[PDB]
């Protein structure tokens, strides 16, 4: 009746406008702003190019042939569209695992992944993803032809169908695709996003807190007191000796860097300084009693103070140290907000105090909460992508094993909506990008 074609036109016209406005927008904002072109966004640019390739070059040749019940277009485009329809899904699935491998190496093992987060590596894997996708999907332009059929009163009409030599070669192809495009990309992404969620659940630690409160400066730089410090708050010497700062530095490390310590050299010295700060608390008869009775969040704050001030300096906070042992947290915060350490470094002192008062990492839960926001978005686009393309790949396997029953039950309206679900996947990714930053303000 008239209702099925009418809803097919307004649905396809809307998803065409949505996928052509967003994907054109995201390729612009990335090609305009070099600040946005991170390693993760480079893959998302490739993912957005394939979604536009599938919407512009393929989505029309799927609706208007169905609405006409005839493939009026030539036989060379039946081979071209099916070629691009297959290449688009292959690069999109395998770019979605590239970001999962990228986020795994950047979070779970940030030490041995330096060969991955380089921009030249991402360019050669999106080149390999696009190149091999065109090579893997070569059977589609080869075994796609026009199948003649009669409609009404000897009305000759053609249809574009994918036909292989035998049924064995047909069911071994759709099994190969379900295996290489959904099953294998599925388990490697659950172990990737699962291991990532394990690290992000570990929360903020003391080494990340001190790395935030101090930062990394490779050259010898003046601290708040004026003395030369290097690395992550490693004091060289309090005596005004510019030569002793170079000698004491080269005495610890294994060469005369003349103030040019590598990034891995500063981490070895930063790990040693924390051990010297926690063992200074254990030997102190005033800091050890309060350290053993504090929470893991509050214990890290006490070591943060020893890292900055020293064992003898913080041990003089006898009024605040007893207040911490008295578990009266809000009162210890007011007593600590009146010291010299709070006025010498107000920003650093406010963070360490709020961890004492609340016992939470909320003062440093910023970059961790931003990393949690990106992973939650990447998990949604993967679930939405699989939810859209599973009905068509599973129905193609049913058609390869039982062609009579599969075509009989779903060939009119059911397959018309199954394909419509697979085409919505091209526009849902730009919609999620918007809904992340203040798009929820609109109404």
């Amino acid at each position: 009746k008239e209702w099925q074609p009418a809803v097919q036109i307004l649905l396809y016209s809307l998803i065409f406008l949505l996928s052509v406005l967003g994907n054109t927008l995201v390729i612009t904002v990335l090609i305009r702003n070099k600040r946005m072109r991170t390693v993760t966004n480079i893959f998302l640019l490739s993912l957005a190019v394939s979604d536009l390739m599938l919407c512009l070059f393929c989505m029309p040749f799927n609706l208007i042939p169905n609405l006409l019940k005839d493939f009026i277009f030539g036989s060379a485009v039946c081979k071209t569209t099916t070629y691009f329809m297959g290449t688009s899904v292959s690069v999109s699935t395998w770019n979605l695992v590239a970001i999962s491998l990228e986020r795994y190496g950047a979070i779970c093992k940030p030490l041995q992944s330096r060969v991955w987060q380089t921009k030249s590596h991402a360019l050669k894997v999106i080149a390999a993803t696009w190149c091999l996708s065109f090579t893997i999907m070569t059977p589609y332009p080869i075994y796609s032809n026009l199948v003649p059929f009669t409609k009404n009163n000897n009305q000759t009409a053609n249809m574009c169908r994918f036909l292989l030599p035998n049924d064995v070669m047909q069911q071994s192809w759709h099994t190969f695709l379900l295996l290489i495009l959904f099953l294998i990309p599925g388990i490697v992404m659950m172990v990737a996003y699962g291991l990532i969620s394990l690290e992000l659940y570990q929360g903020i630690n003391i080494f990340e807190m001190l790395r935030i409160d101090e930062g990394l400066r490779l050259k010898i730089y003046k601290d708040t007191e004026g003395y030369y410090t290097i690395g992550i708050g490693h004091l060289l010497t309090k005596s005004p000796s510019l030569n002793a700062a170079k000698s004491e530095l080269d005495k610890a490390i294994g060469r005369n860097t003349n103030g040019v310590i590598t990034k891995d050299e500063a981490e070895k010295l930063f790990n040693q300084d924390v051990d010297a700060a926690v063992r200074g608390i254990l030997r102190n008869a005033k800091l050890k009693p309060v350290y053993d009775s504090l929470d893991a969040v509050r214990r890290a704050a006490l070591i943060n103070m020893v890292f900055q001030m020293g064992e003898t300096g913080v041990a003089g906070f006898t009024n605040s140290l007893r207040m911490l042992q008295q578990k009266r947290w809000d009162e210890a915060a007011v007593n600590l907000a009146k010291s010299r350490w709070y006025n010498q470094t107000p920003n650093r002192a406010k963070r360490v105090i709020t961890t004492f008062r609340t016992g939470t990492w909320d003062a440093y839960a910023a970059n961790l909460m931003a990393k949690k926001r990106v992973i939650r978005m990447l998990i949604v686009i993967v679930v939405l992508f699989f939810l859209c393309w599973m009905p068509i790949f599973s129905a193609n396997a049913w058609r390869a094993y039982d062609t009579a029953s599969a075509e009989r039950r779903l060939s009119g309206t059911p397959i018309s909506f199954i394909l419509l679900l697979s085409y919505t996947s091209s526009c849902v990714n730009p919609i999620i990008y918007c809904f992340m930053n203040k798009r929820f303000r609109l109404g």
Partner: peptide
């Protein structure tokens, strides 16, 4: 009687 469907 369109029966079946275009590949993808």
């Amino acid at each position: 009687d369109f029966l079946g469907w275009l590949x993808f």
